[PDB]
Amino acid sequence: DTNQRESYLREQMKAIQKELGGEDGLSDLEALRKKIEEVGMPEAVKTKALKELDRLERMQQGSPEATVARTY
């Protein structure tokens, strides 16, 4: 019960970080699609921007691969 109340308690932490939580990885979410075009026209940085474009789209507080794609 300690383990599963810990799990659901941090799940409500994620949910309050998502609905009423404006300060999260969703804060920079608009800056991402705002600045995908300011990535450079050489293939080296453009390719990695486009491959993080879809890898980021999941939840930025609980999903593991979405946070590294979010920060990157």
Binding site: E11, K14, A15, I16, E19, L20
Partner: protein, 216 residues
């Protein structure tokens, strides 16, 4: 200024023209309430910080004192001094001289009286229908509809408004700042805003519960 003994109610400051139930069950308060009815039935009901404190203290009372009169000379035996009271007038506080008894200052007679009956009655009826839908909405915190015996038995909007407002529950300091509003219309808009904000907090709880559901 009227100097009267202090008899406490739990956390509900009596609104003007209110006949409220009384729960005074302290052995140190029966003498004070009997002397209050022995003083030509003139009584102060100063709100208390505690639910039911045994003895008054110089730093343990709420900021509003208020004149009241007692409707009946006998007390219903229920473990407390269940006596039928009435809102006689209003009072104020200047300074404490600690006792016991803590002597309290007073005021002249002050209540609410109706001056208009068209716009006032429309606003009272809007708060009344919002109070009906609020009693239907406060079932999340279980508010009964036995309040409809009093908010519908009365007919005068000046007491209809206070019967609507006293039958619900909110913070005591909001009552200290809403009985500063002698005019009834500001009291109407404050109570209606409280009911609407209760609806909004219900919706906010539902929104965060929906986020918990999709987080699942």
């Amino acid at each position: 200024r009227l100097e009267l003994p202090v008899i406490p109610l739990r956390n509900t400051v009596i609104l003007p023209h209110t006949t409220t139930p009384v729960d005074v069950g302290r052995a140190k308060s029966k003498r004070a309430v009997e002397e209050a009815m022995g003083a030509d039935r003139l009584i102060f009901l100063v709100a208390q910080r505690d639910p039911e404190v045994d003895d008054p203290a110089p730093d343990d009372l709420y900021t509003w004192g208020v004149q009241a009169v007692v409707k009946q000379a006998m007390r219903l035996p229920d473990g407390t001094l269940q006596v039928m009271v009435e809102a006689r007038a209003r009072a104020q506080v200047t300074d404490y001289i600690p006792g016991p008894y803590l002597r309290a200052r007073g005021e002249v007679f002050s209540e609410i009286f109706p001056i208009d009956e068209a716009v006032v009655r429309v606003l009272v009826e809007e708060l009344k229908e919002a109070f009906e839908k609020y009693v239907a909405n406060h079932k999340s915190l279980r508010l009964d509809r036995y309040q409809l015996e009093a908010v519908k038995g009365t007919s005068d909007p000046a007491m209809l408004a206070d019967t609507i407002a006293y039958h619900a529950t909110w913070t005591v300091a909001e009552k200290q700042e809403i009985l500063e509003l002698t005019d009834l219309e500001a009291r109407l808009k404050k109570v209606l805003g409280l009911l609407s904000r209760d609806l909004e907090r219900f919706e906010l709880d539902k929104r965060v519960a929906q986020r918990v559901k999709e987080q699942m």
